[PDB]
Symmetry: C5
Subunit: 146 residues, 5 copies
């Protein structure tokens, strides 16, 4: 995937988990021959789509990373709705894969188990990056060349 | 339906169930006189809409196939929301039927029962392909000729 | 309403209830002076929006008819979400009333009770056609004439 | 506020409660010295957005009035989804305030208590009309002038 | 951030809490070198998106502030849906961060605890303003300059 132009936008709310997701995404990229993806940090998940929109103008794939954990109020629901609506719109507006590596969990324990920290069962940041690269390559093959 | 240009995009997440959906889809297409539909694989359901969008540009119908099974977190809900929002937008943007053969189940048992395996109650992949082809033929008759 | 150009698109999933809805729609149309509305059948509710979009280009109102009954899986929810998002978009894109006569029930008995059979409490097919025609006539009044 | 061009669109479903909302709306408009608002009736809440779209072309603000009361089926949910999606889209397409005076209650008593009868705790018809007028005035001040 | 043009739109439903969110927003802005953000008041949360849309034409970031507290009817859900859908669209239409500082809580107690009063656990008005400003600065760096 060495010719793929990859961007990663990672939210910061939930610093340690977000750092873990970003590390996983960056390692997949480097594993795939990309040592220099564009990496941008934003404060919360709601800020991701507008930045992803900008990044989609100059990249073949964008990986969105973040962590949303339910609390005591309906806020969780609306944060997640905004992200889903935003990322879906951006991908289709730009005809560019925007992989969703934004964790949406009920508990912190669940988020930790999915961030690819040392004891985690999985890494959604890494998975989201494979998805982004694989889709970019597939689109490259489907589009105009001769 | 021998003149209809059909594309099938299939998510890889639950590989065995996805293989089963694709088999049903392909057999329907072949029975209707189409031995060579455009078949594209993607990694996860979220990746389907952007690829479906590309395929809608030069096909009369697109069949989306995949399997989303609910787990411990709200992830299931947001994957399904993205797929719904995306496929709906793509079909209307492109004025092209995008048939939904993306299983959205609570259990693996339920998904298996709907993948048209020897013992399955039904085959969602075959059903979605019938729907895509029937709708394309209907649109052809509705539109400009002769 | 003899001057209004009416289309009716009806899904075939749950055939007898759909037939019942279509009968109610046709009777209202005839009563309002329209013996020959454009009637198109599709396989499932998900196929309605793209066909409604096509019909909206050539008609003053479209009636969407269908039956979606909840089963074992979350699939009901997303089918209904798709229908709602699609018809809403189509109505506003085309500035054309698209009446929602798509039943969304928990049981078959509920669906029967709203299909306007001899024993039914109401006829949603008839209701949706009144809604479509009334709204078309209202828009005709509000828009440019002399 | 005497120079704002106001339109009101009110659905007819639950006629008495719909009339109460409308009286509250008209009272506010008269109280603010408005030239007779454009008043349009539609059959059900789903018809409101397309008519509000037409009204927004010729008015500084639109008040949407209606009553949706939950029953036995999931249909309440999808009616409200459609209204929410439609009105939000119309407001933004037209850059015009569309005030949401559409009651969404679980019971008839709840709707009555919010419709501005002598014994009502609230008057949501009046409130929506205040919001419409205020927002129109705010926009006028924000936009281009001497 | 002294060169960023900031706008704040604040709903007046729940006056005291709104004032508190606004104070947090203004303090963050002042701390980052902005003493004079554009501040606009609206009556309800549903009015925010149309005003944010106007503000986005003339500003680098917009902070939406407000308070939606659940009551006895589903109406809370649809207000929050409208705000979520609206703000998300406005941000992407305008390619401008629209920060969501609209509290969505089950109780008045919860809203007070998130408004940054003296004994509050957090200040979401302050948080939303940091988000808006950080995202504007990020976008400035990503976009065209020499
Ligand atoms: O990445 C995130 N992850 C998050 O978990 C998050 C974020 N972001 N934001 C806010 C953020 O998305 C925006 O920056 C903010 O709304 C301003 O735009 C949140 O308010 N949250 C908290 C959502 C859950 C609310 C809760 F804290 F659990 P509560 O106890 O208030 O219900
Ligand atoms: O076809 C799928 N089928 C799926 O079941 C799926 C997919 N895809 N993706 C993610 C995938 O769609 C994207 O590739 C990813 O978000 C990157 O964009 C998932 O996270 N899932 C799992 C959703 C359910 C998560 C769960 F495992 F059940 P959990 O226990 O974490 O709640
Ligand atoms: O009119 C309908 N009415 C329907 O009830 C329907 C339809 N259509 N479709 C599918 C259909 O909308 C599309 O043709 C298909 O997805 C291909 O695009 C469905 O899958 N359904 C079934 C939804 C209910 C799910 C269930 F069958 F009960 P389950 O037990 O699998 O949850
Ligand atoms: O203003 C309304 N208020 C309403 O309460 C309403 C409306 N409209 N419509 C239908 C109507 O919006 C459209 O005219 C129709 O779908 C055709 O487009 C409804 O079906 N309803 C009722 C929703 C269904 C609830 C119920 F009838 F009680 P049920 O027991 O069937 O769940
Ligand atoms: O900022 C707000 N905060 C709010 O809490 C609010 C607002 N606004 N609006 C209405 C408002 O958004 C609009 O101005 C109105 O719909 C007209 O467009 C409301 O109806 N509410 C009340 C929502 C909850 C309703 C309830 F009071 F809990 P109920 O008991 O009626 O269900
Ligand atoms: K791109
Ligand atoms: K929790
Ligand atoms: K990691
Ligand atoms: K090619
Ligand atoms: K096509
Ligand atoms: K499960
Ligand atoms: K099969
Ligand atoms: K038309
Ligand atoms: K059932
Ligand atoms: K009937
Ligand atoms: K006129
Ligand atoms: K206007
Ligand atoms: K009830
Ligand atoms: K701007
Ligand atoms: K409460
Ligand atoms: K404060
Ligand atoms: K740059």
């Amino acid at each position: 995937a060495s010719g793929v132009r990859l961007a990663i936008v990672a939210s910061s709310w939930h610093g340690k988990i977000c750092d873990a997701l970003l590390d996983g995404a960056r390692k997949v990229a480097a594993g795939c021959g990309l040592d220099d993806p564009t990496v941008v940090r934003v404060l919360g998940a709601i800020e991701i789509p507008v930045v992803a929109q900008e990044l989609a103008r100059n990249h073949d794939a964008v990986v969105a990373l973040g962590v949303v954990i339910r609390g005591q109020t309906p806020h969780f629901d609306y944060v997640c709705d905004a992200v889903t609506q935003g990322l879906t719109r951006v991908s289709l507006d730009s005809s560019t894969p925007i992989a969703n590596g934004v964790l949406t969990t009920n508990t912190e324990e669940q988020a930790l188990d999915r961030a690819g920290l040392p004891t985690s069962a999985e890494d959604k940041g890494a998975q989201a990056t494979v998805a982004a690269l694989a889709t970019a390559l597939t689109l490259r093959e489907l589009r105009a060349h001769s």
